[PDB]
Design a protein around this ligand. Structure first.
Ligand SMILES: Cc1ncc(COP(=O)(O)O)c(C=O)c1O
Ligand SMILES: *Cc1c(COP(=O)(O)O)cnc(C)c1O
Lengths: 456, 417
């Protein structure tokens, strides 16, 4: 008998994927190689505050390179850029400590894996729409998992209450869910954690930079006024007069440096004891090269800047609300959500892909078509993420273009969805939309309304 | 009432509870501070900014192309880190071949161990470099059972080197894929720094430059580097940046790209970091003087230590592990080296190495000229005498002198294409 047909397996797997060809034989190298390869407004981006191109960030990078070079390997003095970045992140989340990883994928995986490796009897309660990095972390934990329906805290409580209090538990969830912009009720989950003796693990990847007075995320937003008053200080009380804020109550908060903060990397912020434990025992931390000083300095600059520029957030939120209100009046079906994301429901993969195909070619607008398996078949959509940079004149070009594409491809509008009973809140007979996280009051704040200590 | 999380953590934690010459470093060729690298960074930032979020991109294609060229593979894929590359590739091979058996060298890096565990398939550990044991394990399965042999070219703590050609021979006979981590060899072995696999056909590769040669050093059809199915490396050590990669056939690369979540669900590395790595790889490929100089410095330090009876763990690589055999004395030795001689050397203890085999790790670079080496030899000799450490009595190189006499103009001009 001959060997396993490795090539046959790969070929059959690949034949299912839509991969056209870029590799060709080159006489000069006597082998195959990959053959090498405009003015477009980007309306879908993870660079939510446009900080990746901000002067303070680029300046911090250039200057750090002058001092330190490229990689961490060329430095001996943790190094100072690491301490600076960890301190900034701990400050942002008002935690005792923080730890930086290669990516938030690795952060999620390393933390969740370690909790399950050290507590074999841990039970994880996981929101059904958690990011793949959390799913993989929970899998790598090799502990029991119960999935609760998205944001269904009735179902979460039933699952939690079925166990004795003394059983170790973790509730794992995101603050903002990127594909529809839904938002967890963090305070209620913290309440449940207290009652049923659970740790909380919160992924604020799609909130950091964007929520709370200082961009510390939805957890900060839950005690908006306490945090605004205290600045970088731990407030004496929370918004309802109690001792501990929501962000204080969450055990573990993970984020990225790769989105709002205009760089790359991930982190967890937590108690000194949790951070020391991760640092001591997590192989995905221990056994990998530190991020380059320049990248860490850039992230640090972005965090410091965004903390004291609430006008970044108020600007993003106003642009979002401008786009949403316009779409509402035109009957363009946005999945209702209280966040910064504008998901336009199409409900057809071919038509969703064809819409962003026309947006790009005919209107020079980039918008991402989202299909299965990212979302459910039937719920396909265009994802739009307004930024501080999307002024009303750019928004006006986006609204006209999208309206034009809806008419060109004859896509369903809000009232069409209604006649089918609705979908994901769109044209749903008597749906009670959540209020926007950002109130009118909060949106009228300026940088002068921040505590002066946010610059020192 | 509730579970004592804090009590568990405390218990776990309690169970573990200036101008200095750096002589231990993963920045083997000092390229993290090389002007071409810094220039490529500064220029890329001006064009692209900081993170990839604000921008495949051209920097990614350029970097992947360079790495494919380095290893003379059809393609390459860049990940966050070599840790992630190793984990993602090993995991996917196990997930897609349900009857896969992985055969793993006992001293493989933690990232490979975790990748293998995530693959969740049958696993056999063979004693370090023991190819008799490897063969016995391979022959105990039918040929038609899919297999993977996972190993490193150079092992960082003692500088031992895999017999890559013989493992490829075994792979052929027993129907196995080979997965090779060249993290501690890229930059440092072969005419172009492509690693130990390249070095196995040094003359064929030197002659052909960036081209695939039609014969190998012993007259056969396929070079060692060509026979290895998957090669992983880092951008974070020799190449003076951050990131990892695998280089392999187009079909393997397309498959990894299509199916690996630890690729798909992470932010692309910053363009500047990729540009820097690219410049470092391009530079080092056409500067064999980097390697010949590193190797000469190493051999200079080793020969001196040999005549002084300072116990270097014998190895054919660039690493100088000085055996101490006591954790307290090993830590105290590098403590005196730093305070009294302004020399930095890393003490290596359990669990990195076996209890009893504690050592100082020394990694000579192109920058360590003989005058600096002379300061290192005197200082180490002084510390051995101060702490009364055991010497040799108490207890060949991959680079030939032929290879060491090559200069940059002995390379094919096509290496600057
Ligand atoms: C919700 C969520 N969590 C975690 C991550 C991982 O972040 P990073 O890209 O820094 O690895 C992402 C990234 O897309 C994410 O969207
Ligand atoms: C350092 C190391 C790596 C890890 O690579 P990073 O890119 O630093 O994650 C992997 N393999 C080996 C053998 C190493 O020594």
């Amino acid at each position: 008998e001959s060997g396993f047909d490795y090539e046959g397996l790969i070929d059959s797997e690949l034949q299912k994927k839509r991969l056209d060809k870029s590799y060709r034989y080159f006489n000069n190298i006597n082998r195959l190689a990959k053959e090498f390869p405009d003015k477009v407004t980007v309306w879908c981006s993870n660079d939510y505050l446009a900080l990746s191109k901000h002067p303070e960030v680029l300046d911090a990078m250039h200057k750090t390179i002058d001092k330190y070079g490229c990689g961490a390997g060329g430095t001996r003095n943790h190094n100072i850029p690491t301490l600076n970045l960890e301190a900034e992140l701990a400050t942002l989340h008002k935690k005792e400590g923080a730890l930086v990883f290669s990516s938030c994928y690795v952060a999620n995986d390393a933390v969740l894996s370690l909790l399950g490796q050290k507590m074999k009897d841990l039970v994880i309660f996981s929101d059904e729409l958690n990011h793949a990095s959390m799913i993989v972390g929970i899998k790598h934990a090799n502990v029991k998992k119960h999935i609760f329906k998205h944001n269904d805290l009735n179902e979460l409580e039933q699952l939690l209450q079925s166990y004795p209090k003394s059983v170790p538990k973790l509730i794992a969830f995101e603050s903002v869910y990127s594909m529809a912009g839904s938002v967890a009720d963090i305070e209620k989950i913290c309440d449940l954690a207290d009652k049923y003796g659970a740790l909380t693990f919160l992924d604020e990847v799609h909130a950091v930079g964007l929520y709370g007075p200082h961009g510390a995320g939805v957890a900060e937003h839950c005690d908006f006024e306490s945090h605004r008053a205290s600045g970088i200080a731990t407030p004496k009380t929370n918004d309802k007069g109690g001792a501990k804020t929501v962000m204080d109550r969450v055990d573990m908060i993970t984020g990225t440096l790769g989105k709002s903060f205009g760089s790359v990397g991930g982190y967890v912020a937590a108690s000194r004891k949790l951070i020391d434990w991760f640092r001591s025992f997590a192989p995905g931390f221990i056994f990998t090269t530190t991020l380059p000083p320049s990248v860490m300095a850039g992230a640090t600059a972005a965090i410091r800047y965004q903390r004291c520029h609430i006008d970044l957030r108020t600007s993003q939120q106003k642009h979002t609300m401008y786009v949403k209100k316009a779409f509402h009046e035109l009957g363009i079906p946005v999945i209702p959500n209280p966040s910064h994301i504008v998901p336009v429901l199409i409900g057809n993969a071919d038509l969703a892909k064809q819409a962003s195909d026309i947006l790009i070619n005919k209107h020079q607008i980039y918008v991402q078509a989202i299909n299965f398996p990212t979302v459910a078949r039937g719920t396909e959509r265009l994802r739009i993420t307004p930024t501080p940079g999307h002024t009303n004149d750019l928004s006006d070009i986006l609204i006209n273009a999208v309206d034009d594409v809806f008419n060109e491809l004859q896509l369903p509008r809000v009232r069409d969805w209604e006649s089918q009973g609705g979908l994901l809140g769109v044209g749903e007979s008597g749906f009670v939309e959540e209020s926007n996280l950002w109130t009118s009051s909060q949106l009228s704040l300026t940088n002068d309304d921040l505590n002066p200590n946010v610059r020192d």
